[PDB]
Design a protein around this ligand. Structure first.
Ligand SMILES: [Fe+3]
Ligand SMILES: [Fe+3]
Ligand SMILES: [Fe+3]
Ligand SMILES: [Fe+3]
Ligand SMILES: [Fe+3]
Ligand SMILES: [Fe+3]
Ligand SMILES: [Fe+3]
Ligand SMILES: [Fe+3]
Ligand SMILES: [Fe+3]
Ligand SMILES: [Fe+3]
Ligand SMILES: [Fe+3]
Ligand SMILES: [Fe+3]
Ligand SMILES: [Fe+3]
Ligand SMILES: [Fe+3]
Lengths: 172, 172, 172, 172, 172, 172
């Protein structure tokens, strides 16, 4: 039987499929970062990062749904193993903030290509994703700011972790 | 600062980490099977398999939580690209049922090792997982049975897909 | 059309089918014991034993459902006629307690074989059945204890029967 | 101690005891037919026949209650192994309908004997049973009619099974 | 008058009675640890450990009930005065965590023997106890992790005690 | 760091700590007596004595709280195993009543010493304990009176146990 062709252009298909794989990779990285925190007495950051990992996977699913609805084949590639070696809480959040900046940039690129191609169905679709990503980037900036304000001397790590614990709990 | 050692034995830790990666692999395979269905006018099976993919990831998360609570580092490996080319609905569900049999066997292996190790905290933890996996395996057996009963003649594909659509909607 | 093979091993199939037939036999025995009590002015024990008979049949049904769901043929054999000759209330409950001990042993055997075969779907399934059987065995032990404490002199049979009547009513 | 004699005549007692054993036999036959369906991808008929088997046992219990209340010893015989090999859905429902005709006739015989004996307590007691059996006989007539109308061609079996599934679910 | 024999095997009886006594002794140890904290300005840990002592006695009672229901004589042994001298908060929780590990191991031993014995009534009964003990062990690991993370420099002891206080209150 | 001295006098401390241990001893004694009843078909007395044992431990806990709040070290001592061999229901309740008289006497002694010491915080605190112990002593007098009224003979033991069972349940 005949099924309708993909409803999106080849370039937009490529960018969206790449994005699904970025979000899956991201999810694995945050699970790894979360585990590091949990195994180093930082269960506040552990919880926060675990919940954030699950959220990135929710983004991958929503992108997959959009590809499905447009009759676009989902192309899952090999998801490379995430980094597991970390130095401490500050380095984890520095790496995470830089990672969120890269994710924001990748989304801005898809949205820009949608504009150039005149694919306004995709432009309109991606708006929740732009908004939620901006909120996540700001969140990591704020937590990093706080970790650096507190510092790691004289029970600072505990204070930072409790601070993050409070954020994690308020968000669920 | 000193954090407590992993609370589980090395063998149990390795099997559980392997199981996490099994469920992630599973989730990707089912997303790919789902996509195939969606792009071949089988949105009932597409939905069913998408929701099943998501459920497998939920199992991975639950295993991760148990690892975190026991101070066990989570070791996420590379996730390999899933199969993406399929012959049809029957082949997909034959493959899927065979896959679910393998998953069931893999869980039985962990539970067996927990008994042999006298790790009854892990034995007890795994009971929800044994139960839910059994229900999933029976489900795939039932769907495969139905696809085979209906046949692909005439509008058999439509009929099988609608039947799977009904199951997908009922399980939400 | 092709239907999937039985999902359980041959040994577990045999033990489970035998158990369905044990529970059906048990149900008939309790109906017979119940009738003896009713026709000898012991309507308390009559009711209790009737309700217990119906419960054993409910166990047979739940086992049948599990066999059905695993695509395992239910093999009902000839159910031999139950004993009908009884000496009195004490002998009925002595026989019944010994019978419940045999039923408990038979269930422990299936669960042990599930462990040996690594069939943890069946092990997990049987847990309600282990729990409910233990409660029933304890119940018969308690009633037997009470019948022997009261004794059969000077309206003791009436007191024992009213005691059992109270238990029967509280359980429904 | 002296207990009152059976409150019913010998002929009525024998017919009622025979009817109890008829319903137990019936229940087993239907469990076996149900199993056949479940193991041949007909879970709609499997469910319908399982629930019907259970209902026949409920009739046996109700007859037992009446016997107990009249101080009539219940005589449970050996229950013979039911037929387990069947040709298909149509043959099962042909056999089942014929079986229900025989059950209806057997009840008519008891009611007739009650009239001839002037046993109007038994006549009156049996009215729920006459009524419910008539509804059961009509049901099997209707299902057989539908199976024959649909046919087994193409996906006829699927269609008939789904129709029976709908009836099974509606009767709960 | 004759009472029924104990319903459990001699080895299971010995292990269960030993466990009752272990829980009683645990309650004493925790009361003593609690008192140390209350008398050294650590009312957070004081409260936590008092409430935990009380919960160990609740375990002893649940074990006693199971022995009673099986007609197994409870054999309470002599109590030896618990340790009353401690060095500080950290040492108390190090000792406590080590104690909880010993308790977990002792339960795993009973569960293992129940398996080897084919005593699945006992296996099944112990499952709440396995699950609750694992939760207690994890809790003591978490608290010790937090105590080590905070330190006793500056007002570290205050912060750690306040942390434990919050946990004690949240568990009520 | 400096913690405040005990707020009670040395003599009052000694008597209160001895009292904690008396209550602990009572708990054990009543658990043992309870077990004897349960293994000799007297589940009414079994339940009554078990619940009483638990209530004695509640008294110990309440005394412990008062010591803690006053910065008084809890001094839990070695206690002999409780008696495990008994002659029968009457002898158990005679021993128990005698025991309750001794406990009452021990409380009166502390209250007396509080008056003499002008320790009215302690006098005031103990009033619930005086009141509850008086009720318990009266209760054991009433049960013993009833046991002696009923007698051992001609199902008297059963009647006495059912009577105690009613009290056990009414007290919740
Ligand atoms: Fe993000
Ligand atoms: Fe994102
Ligand atoms: Fe699965
Ligand atoms: Fe799974
Ligand atoms: Fe039973
Ligand atoms: Fe049973
Ligand atoms: Fe019928
Ligand atoms: Fe009928
Ligand atoms: Fe059709
Ligand atoms: Fe514990
Ligand atoms: Fe414990
Ligand atoms: Fe008292
Ligand atoms: Fe007292
Ligand atoms: Fe009397």
């Amino acid at each position: 039987h005949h099924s309708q062709d993909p409803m999106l252009s080849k370039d937009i298909i490529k960018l969206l499929n790449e994005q699904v794989n970025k979000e899956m990779n991201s999810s694995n990285l945050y699970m790894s970062m979360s585990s590091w925190c949990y195994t180093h007495s930082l269960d506040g950051a552990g919880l926060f990062l675990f919940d954030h990992a699950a959220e990135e996977y929710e983004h991958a699913k929503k992108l997959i749904i959009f590809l499905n609805e447009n009759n676009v084949p989902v192309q899952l590639t090999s998801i490379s193993a995430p980094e597991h070696k970390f130095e401490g809480l500050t380095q984890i959040f520095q790496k995470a903030y830089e990672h969120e900046q890269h994710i924001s940039e990748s989304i801005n690129n898809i949205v820009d290509h949608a504009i150039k191609s005149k694919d306004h169905a995709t432009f309109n679709f991606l708006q929740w994703y732009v908004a939620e990503q901006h909120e996540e980037e700001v969140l990591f900036k704020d937590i990093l700011d706080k970790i650096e304000l507190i510092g790691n001397e004289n029970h600072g790590l505990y204070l930072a972790d409790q601070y993050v614990k409070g954020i994690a709990k308020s968000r669920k």
